[PDB]
Amino acid sequence: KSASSLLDLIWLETILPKTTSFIQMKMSIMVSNQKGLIKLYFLSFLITIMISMTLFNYHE
């Protein structure tokens, strides 16, 4: 119940390896679901332009 199960095969596998897989996966579904509308793409360009020029103080 412990040792072989719980700690191993459940816990030690769900803390380091699988959680990193889940973290890499939850937003993988996101960053690969762009709706394909040109309006949304160029609107994200506006923000990326706006935040970089002055809001992040990237000029200086």
Partner: protein, 98 residues
């Protein structure tokens, strides 16, 4: 930096914002694409004409001859999507979802 220079670059800035703020018409975006090269032409001309950079008068025309060349292909691109979709509406310009 005088006011006449400011009004042009600011016009470019608002032209840039409207270009990437696609409404439900590709022609309007193409029209708003038309803004900057004219703003670029105007902005370039005041700089070059003011500073008496005689040879640099090249570039204003050089700017226009090719910056209009995309408009040559862009309009045909617009009529191409309007020959299969029958509409310049950009909401249907998303067939490349997957």
């Amino acid at each position: 930096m005088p006011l006449v220079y400011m009004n042009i670059i600011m016009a470019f800035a608002i032209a840039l914002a409207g270009l990437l703020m696609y409404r439900s018409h590709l022609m309007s975006s193409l029209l708003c694409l038309e803004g900057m090269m004219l703003s670029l032409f105007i902005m370039s001309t005041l700089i070059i004409l003011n500073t008496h950079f005689t040879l640099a008068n090249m570039m204003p025309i050089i700017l226009l001859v090719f910056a209009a060349c995309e408009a040559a292909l862009g309009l045909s691109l617009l009529v191409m999507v309007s020959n299969t979709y029958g509409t310049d509406y950009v909401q249907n310009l998303n067939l490349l979802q997957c």
